[PDB]
Amino acid sequence: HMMEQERWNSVDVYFSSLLVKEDEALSKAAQAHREFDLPDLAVSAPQGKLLHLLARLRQARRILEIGTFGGYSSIWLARALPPDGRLVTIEWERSFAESAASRLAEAGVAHLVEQHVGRALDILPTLDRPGTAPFDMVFVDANKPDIPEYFTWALKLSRPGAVVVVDNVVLGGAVTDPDHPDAGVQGVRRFHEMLAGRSDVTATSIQTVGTKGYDGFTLALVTG
Amino acid sequence: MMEQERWNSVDVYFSSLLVKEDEALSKAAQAHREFDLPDLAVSAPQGKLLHLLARLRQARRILEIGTFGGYSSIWLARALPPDGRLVTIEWERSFAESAASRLAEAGVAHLVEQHVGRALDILPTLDRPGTAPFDMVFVDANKPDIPEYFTWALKLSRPGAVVVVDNVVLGGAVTDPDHPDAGVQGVRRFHEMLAGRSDVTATSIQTVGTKGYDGFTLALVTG
């Protein structure tokens, strides 16, 4: 009889089989973790499709991504863009970014993507310039301790109406513990506290299960 | 900590910081107690998500199938611009009247056109000269008719419209081709219809929280 993760997988595989197609570029990007002996860090296919649909619903022309990894989420985001759009994506590990570059070329979207290699908090201030900012959508999916600062930068680099999605905000439930010693937990808590404390952005957080296990995301709308 | 206890606690935590309920919403959330029914309404995080999706789309015209007590209705109507409209459908007159009171309390009754009756009877009448197409459709009524609610959503909406269907996981029963339940088979047929056409594109997300394990489908009409 199926174990719990097997049940979540079976439902995800079922929905995915009918709703989400992966071509060569996506199916290859989804295996980036195997090249680097890492756990699967990419959004699932249904999650990447959701990011794609959110960008298209927003009619996003400029998208900022913090955390390229192997380019899986990047392909979904770039494929939401119009021909004059741009995805700016940031990755700390050069080898990952180089792998992503190969996937984005295979995907036919290299002309839409501006990749940066380095620490996101070093790169983000360099993006506050005409032709790059303002972004219509920001996807935050890198290290968790810096989420508050990434959110601050998302606000500085975007505009009223912009959508900000922050991945992996559940941390196994540890986010409810004010005394938890992990900096990532405290960063996610600080971020939610920042959202509570201002009225020019409005948000919700959704817990999910599926092939990635139990986690969740935050969706914020900048209102001004 | 038990799994469901954790899911509840995390939802309580996120909602405490991100989702406000005023009198109208807090009252609407208790509608099931008056109705002597289980809590069928979207949770606060889920209602907020519906609200944000509508605003992200800049929806001016929204269609809702399944008013119940008006909890989801308030969230959708509050996403509208001043000249927007929410059209919502409910078969049970007593539920619709309760929702009407909530929508007045919420300050959005003037933006809402409520219909009482069987949804498949009402939906054809909405294809009317002088009515703009819908920008968003929320499908949250009975499960067996979801396929026909979906094709009505396509008929009554424009390219770019967002369609959200609630409660599509059914405890995982949807993976079973032999399941006897008409609602399970309706959700399955709806997903098969999405697979079989190219003028709409979608994803389905499994969620957990205060209401347990379930999920929703989000579709973008492309033409």
Ligand SMILES: C[S@@+](CC[C@H](N)C(=O)[O-])C[C@H]1O[C@@H](n2cnc3c(N)ncnc32)[C@H](O)[C@@H]1O
């Ligand atoms: C969860 S993975 C991103 C997965 C990708 N968004 C997807 O869904 O396909 C997180 C990534 O952030 C990168 N990263 C971690 N800390 C970083 C930092 N300070 N600046 C930039 N990238 C960082 C990691 O190297 C890793 O590739």
Ligand SMILES: C[S@@+](CC[C@H](N)C(=O)[O-])C[C@H]1O[C@@H](n2cnc3c(N)ncnc32)[C@H](O)[C@@H]1O
């Ligand atoms: C899940 S509840 C809706 C909850 C509401 N959308 C919310 O989140 O606050 C389902 C509703 O659909 C109504 N309903 C069921 N079958 C229907 C039908 N054939 N036509 C119209 N309404 C129907 C039920 O009476 C009930 O109020």
